[PDB]
Amino acid sequence: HALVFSYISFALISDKRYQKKEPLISSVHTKVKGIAEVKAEILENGMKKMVSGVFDTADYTFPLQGNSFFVMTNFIKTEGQQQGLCPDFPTARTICSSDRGCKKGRMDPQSKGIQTGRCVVYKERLKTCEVSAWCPIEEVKDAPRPALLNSAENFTVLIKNNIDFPGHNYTTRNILPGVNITCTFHKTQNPQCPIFRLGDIFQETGDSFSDVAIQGGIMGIEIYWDCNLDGWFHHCRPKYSFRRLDDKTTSESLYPGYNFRYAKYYKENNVEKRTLIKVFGIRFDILVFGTGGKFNVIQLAVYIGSVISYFGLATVF
Amino acid sequence: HALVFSYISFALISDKRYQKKEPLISSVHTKVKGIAEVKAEILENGMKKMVSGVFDTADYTFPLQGNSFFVMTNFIKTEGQQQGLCPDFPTARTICSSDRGCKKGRMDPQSKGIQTGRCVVYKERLKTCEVSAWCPIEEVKDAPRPALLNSAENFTVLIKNNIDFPGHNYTTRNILPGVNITCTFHKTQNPQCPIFRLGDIFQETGDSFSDVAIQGGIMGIEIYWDCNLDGWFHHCRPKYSFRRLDDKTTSESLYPGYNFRYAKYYKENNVEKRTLIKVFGIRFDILVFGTGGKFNVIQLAVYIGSVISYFGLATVF
Amino acid sequence: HALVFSYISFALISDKRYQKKEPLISSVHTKVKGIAEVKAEILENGMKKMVSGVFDTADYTFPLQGNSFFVMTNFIKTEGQQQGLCPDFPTARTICSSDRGCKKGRMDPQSKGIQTGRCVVYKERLKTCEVSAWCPIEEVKDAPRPALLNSAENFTVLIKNNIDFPGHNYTTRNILPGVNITCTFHKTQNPQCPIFRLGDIFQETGDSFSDVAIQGGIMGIEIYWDCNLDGWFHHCRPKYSFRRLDDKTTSESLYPGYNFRYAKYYKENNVEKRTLIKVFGIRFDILVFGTGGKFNVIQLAVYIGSVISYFGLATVF
Numbered sequence A, B, C: 001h002a003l004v005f006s007y008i009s010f011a012l013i014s015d016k017r018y019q020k021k022e023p024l025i026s027s028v029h030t031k032v033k034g035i036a037e038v039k040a041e042i043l044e045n046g047m048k049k050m051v052s053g054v055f056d057t058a059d060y061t062f063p064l065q066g067n068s069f070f071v072m073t074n075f076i077k078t079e080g081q082q083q084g085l086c087p088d089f090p091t092a093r094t095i096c097s098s099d100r101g102c103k104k105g106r107m108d109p110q111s112k113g114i115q116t117g118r119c120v121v122y123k124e125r126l127k128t129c130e131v132s133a134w135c136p137i138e139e140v141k142d143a144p145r146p147a148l149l150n151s152a153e154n155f156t157v158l159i160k161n162n163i164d165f166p167g168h169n170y171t172t173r174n175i176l177p178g179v180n181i182t183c184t185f186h187k188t189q190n191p192q193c194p195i196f197r198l199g200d201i202f203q204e205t206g207d208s209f210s211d212v213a214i215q216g217g218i219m220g221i222e223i224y225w226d227c228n229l230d231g232w233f234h235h236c237r238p239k240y241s242f243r244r245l246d247d248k249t250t251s252e253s254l255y256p257g258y259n260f261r262y263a264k265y266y267k268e269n270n271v272e273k274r275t276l277i278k279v280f281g282i283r284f285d286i287l288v289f290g291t292g293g294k295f296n297v298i299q300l301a302v303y304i305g306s307v308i309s310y311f312g313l314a315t316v317f
């Protein structure tokens, strides 16, 4: 009988039924470091071109917005586009035998322009449907074989997190004072180091960083706060985990990976022009979840409220 | 008497008091499709101008940041601005009879520059207060009558959501494998289709897409997760709803609609210049709320704790 | 004895144990107003330069993304950078006595380029390690003494918040209809005014706006919703508080303040060039927390469930 009430008291102790718990408030500030040297050969419009250059922080990333940041790992440039008419890029949907194959005004999800209803030669007696759009249309080409910014895994993101508990008067930050900032997070050797190498993140989740860096993906950093605001036992430290939020579908229809089309408008020869940059990379979403706990009498009097009935039926047997 | 305890047991079953519930973690990835052909006539500075051009994804949208994305539906361009002095645009506040009407250094919330304290002619013996700013000052003109990118309603946003339950070992995604991705969400015909036409969203909420697209607004996509992590009955699917978060005030003071001023800096003739683009559109905020539920003994022993007292008083009558 | 049951009933009344509480859904829309006149003298590469110009909304801010916005308060420009080789900027780590001091391919976290392994003169027989990068390398210089956009504190952010309670059928907005929008938030004189002067925010938190505006920081706006969805007593208004989320470390290693490196690519003389803008400012994170409360029988029958045991043991004494 009494051991049953020690099981109730156990449920209280271990389940922290005596504590009030409150959802944590998270603010995030991330600063990434590293530079990537890009020397590769890439064929554009059937002509080989040499891509050489250095990429510093400004060239491959922007500031954190909404608790997530992005790291361009690959890209494709289509310079000199300008408003006009041009034959769409040859694909199963763009290729026409005669003017009747193209319907004027038609626009297909794969096309970047509105059809003109006319069939015209793209190259060497091979005709696609003419469209109106930014010309010439970007190639329906795959990303470079090895990701141009393959060095991305060697980069290091420094994460600084500030968690607040409105219910209590308690606020704290990921980086406690006086810690040795020279470190690299390790599941075991540096569980509280806020410097994270990207390749390490991809290994922890068991995903090859290069593969994802070719077409892009969405990684995810989780920060757990099981904080105890009690004077007796008080613990409040983060728990870093890693999960690949990216879907990994691998189906043209579900737009696999992570990539977006960036536009850089400029004027040349009194003409309105636009360089189009298809950008691939990993987007890192930082997910911070917390629960603050303190001693509460009302919760112990309600838990007592249930335990006194449980006690009456326990004594009835 | 016993029917009272069947009412308690009912409250348990229907209220899921036996389950532990946990807040869901949401990651969002949105890819929008569609292109808008813009041919319209718009008067700038008293002179008619012809706006013709095609707008692809890159021209009217940027990537999702913070679980929300934006779709430019209208705009106004003020090309060639450069640092200098110019007479402010004529309005009830800018118009002066004499140099005494303007105070040097004064800046009014409607003005885009600091007054020079001098009264100067803007056009045809009509004087406004001279200011220092990007010159010439953007017209205090209304947005184009029909939204230039009125085609926006025909666009389709594909939403991909990944929800995780840290408490459990359970993670899932909006798009289950093998589904027919060729679809358009319908309240009844496609409750799980993640392709959403914008016009459909505006109809569901009962707002004309054109009206909002003229001056801009903030729409809102809600995704409900009432997931049951029990082995007996396990359900975990999203519930799409639509709500217009935009205020719809219609008062100059409350800055109605959604619009922002974008700056494009460029150099011409060894001069620093800036094209100013007032941008109008709908911002789409994706709100994902979830609750995961599993069987918990401590909660059933505490609910039992209350139900045994309720039982004692029920028997006392 | 009975006073004990009035203490239980008190815990019910004051703790609102009879109510079901639900987490609030927050949407935020912020429009900032103000313009800053920048006239200052700043030395670049050992030569004095005069920075004069006006800065309107477009020049110093972008739209809210993820419930936070940014206000550039200071900056440093490095115009004309272009891909090439150049001697790194002289610092304790870049300075070399001989070619042996530099290792080819080496890249240090402070460096913005990959070393060429060669020691070259930066200026006046003082040699740094040659690197490949955007040349010339940005100066390792401190921000301007008084923040160029020191006027930032006089700016006014208008915040418009829309909170929804999915559980109930209840939705509301920060700005109730018909209120006098002409106001400035005051802890006591305007607790519901949604116009916030920045300097006021920094004073409330007890931080000098100028100091933070020199190197940058992360401020934080909190909006409390302790809403009561009961018909008897119904209150649903926001509670504005201010907290400095910024860390304030003041250690080179922890990247103190708030600043990022922005890149503006342009072409000159058939050459690829890049103006680099180190941007400093305050990022304002808007934290909205809410709890909606209504009357619930199941919660009053479970609280009664605990209170009937508490009653039995109370009577046992």
Ligand SMILES: *[C@@H]1O[C@H](CO)[C@@H](O)[C@H](O)[C@H]1NC(C)=O
Pocket (backbone or CB within 6 Å): A150, A151, A152, A154
């Ligand atoms: C990344 O760094 C490792 C050393 O940690 C090096 O062996 C490897 O070659 C580097 N890879 C790239 C692409 O820079």
Ligand SMILES: *[C@@H]1O[C@H](CO)[C@@H](O)[C@H](O)[C@H]1NC(C)=O
Pocket (backbone or CB within 6 Å): A180, A182, A183
């Ligand atoms: C930090 O740790 C590294 C070794 O990981 C050591 O070389 C360095 O001296 C330490 N610095 C401080 C300040 O403790």
Ligand SMILES: *[C@@H]1O[C@H](CO)[C@@H](O)[C@H](O)[C@H]1NC(C)=O
Pocket (backbone or CB within 6 Å): B150, B151, B152, B154
């Ligand atoms: C949008 O598409 C519909 C067909 O679904 C068409 O009737 C309508 O004219 C289109 N409107 C615009 C502005 O493209």
Ligand SMILES: *[C@@H]1O[C@H](CO)[C@@H](O)[C@H](O)[C@H]1NC(C)=O
Pocket (backbone or CB within 6 Å): B180, B182, B183
């Ligand atoms: C998907 O559904 C459409 C009809 O809505 C049909 O035409 C198409 O063949 C289907 N595809 C698959 C793979 O089921």
Ligand SMILES: *[C@@H]1O[C@H](CO)[C@@H](O)[C@H](O)[C@H]1NC(C)=O
Pocket (backbone or CB within 6 Å): C150, C151, C152, C154
């Ligand atoms: C800010 O405004 C105050 C008046 O409210 C004025 O006294 C002060 O000089 C202004 N400072 C700047 C930097 O504009």
Ligand SMILES: *[C@@H]1O[C@H](CO)[C@@H](O)[C@H](O)[C@H]1NC(C)=O
Pocket (backbone or CB within 6 Å): C180, C182, C183
């Ligand atoms: C708003 O209050 C100000 C004083 O703070 C007053 O001058 C103005 O007339 C008021 N406007 C309205 C519409 O109440």
